[PDB]
Amino acid sequence: PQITLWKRPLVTIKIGGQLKEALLDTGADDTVIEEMSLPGRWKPKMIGGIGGFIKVRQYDQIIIEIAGHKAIGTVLVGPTPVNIIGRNLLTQIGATLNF
């Protein structure tokens, strides 16, 4: 698909058995999801952006389905204002920016 950018590029994802809405975000290195439980081990991380840093839990080798495309990678979980699909998973679904 081709997603224009007139509006936020929001898609449905499936993660942890849950459906969520998330932003396809080429400015995010990593994928950051609002608070939820995920299985397996995790470690803490700080991530920073506008307004400063938040603490998140880093879960590795998490399968996600992004607009119907499965991928695996690291997911950060914490108090993000919006669920973000970052480049670590955008690459896996073959997403590119074109102009």
Residues with a known catalytic role:
25
- C-alpha to C-alpha distance for 72 and 92, rounded to whole angstroms: 8
Listed in sequence order, the residues at least 6 apart from 1 whose beta carbon sits closer than 8 Å to its beta carbon are 67
Q: How far is the CB of 12 from ligand GR5 (least distance, A)?
A: 17
Instruction: Establish if 62 lies at the interface with a copy of itself (CB under 8 A).
Output: no
| Binders in 3-42 for a copy of itself, by CB under 8 A | 3-6, 8-9, 23-29, 32
User: In angstroms, what CA-CA distances link 47 with 6, 28, 44, 58, 85?
Assistant: 28, 10, 10, 11, 14
| Binders in 36-75 for ligand GR5, by CB under 6 A | 47-50
- C-alpha to C-alpha distance for 70 and 41, rounded to whole angstroms: 21
* Interacting partner of 99 out of a copy of itself, ligand GR5, Na ion, none (Cβ under 5 to 8 A depending on kind): a copy of itself
Residues that bind a copy of itself (CB under 8 A): 1-6, 8-9, 23-29, 32, 47-54, 67, 69, 80-82, 84, 87, 90-91, 93-99
